[PDB]
């Protein structure tokens, strides 16, 4: 797509395409180049992005996250804001575009030595992720995929963090209605296999704890530079395993991974608490929370050094 393209989203905003960074910077076609603090997301009518699409019409409406945010006490909320959508022509083909807030670089171009992060930022990272995940569960959605690759920092504010990329999040409980419990092995192993929940790898359609249970790998992935299961990754069958003896074998399993100098006690915990919710159980994120900030230390700015690396 040409720069200076001119699209028109279903509300009858007009916005202009900027450089690629498919996703390009955008100006709405009122405000000067200046102020650009939007892009613009695009795909043909073929899959994903329409996926996402649902996710962010229906849950990244800024009035309501505000309301939320000044209700429980945030500084932020780690969601992007989503400003309009549509189609646009390109030869005879239909595009689908969203348009949504700019962020900056994400969290695996950035991580240190092993894919790793300091304790303290590992730490905020999970606390940052379960505001994020109360809002959606609330809102009926689970994400499905998080990992460094899907966290990224702001553009406006550079010093927060976003989860991103909801092309395979999931409305697990449309209008109330919480989907049922059916194993199939036809649709097994979706998502990261190396932080992808078992729900996922059984072929069960995501809930709530699925998202918490991923969480709990990429906590420990980042704070310990690799996961037991490393070497499998091309097994999924290799990988359920190793995650379901990880989980029997709790605290003491993902205890004793840590390195002498990063503790996993707040990690274990957490997973602890993760792998006792039921199928249709609301995660008590609070408690998760705590559970990673056991001493109620302020969230700092996230540390991000590699000195010594
Ligand atoms: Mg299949």
Known sequence: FPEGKVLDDMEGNQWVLGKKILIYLAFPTNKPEKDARHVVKVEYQEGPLFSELKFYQRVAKKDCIKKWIERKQLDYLGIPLFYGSGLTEFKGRSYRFMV????????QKISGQNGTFKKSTVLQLGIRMLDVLEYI????????????????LGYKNPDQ???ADYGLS???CPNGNHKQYQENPRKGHNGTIEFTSLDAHKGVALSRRS?????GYCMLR???????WEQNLKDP?????????LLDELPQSVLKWAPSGSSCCEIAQFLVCAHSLAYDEKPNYQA????????????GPLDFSTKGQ
């Open 100 to 107: 949504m807030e700019r962020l900056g670089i994400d969290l």
């Open 137 to 152: 569960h609330e809102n009926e959605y689970v994400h499905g995929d998080i990992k460094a690759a899907n966290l990224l």
């Open 161 to 163: 963090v976003y989860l």
């Open 170 to 172: 999931y409305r697990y």
């Open 211 to 215: 998202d918490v249970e991923i969480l």
């Open 222 to 228: 980042w704070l310990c530079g690799k996961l037991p």
């Open 237 to 245: 069958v290799a990988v359920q395993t190793a995650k379901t003896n």
């Open 288 to 299: 998760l929370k705590k559970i990673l900030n056991p001493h109620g230390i302020p969230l």
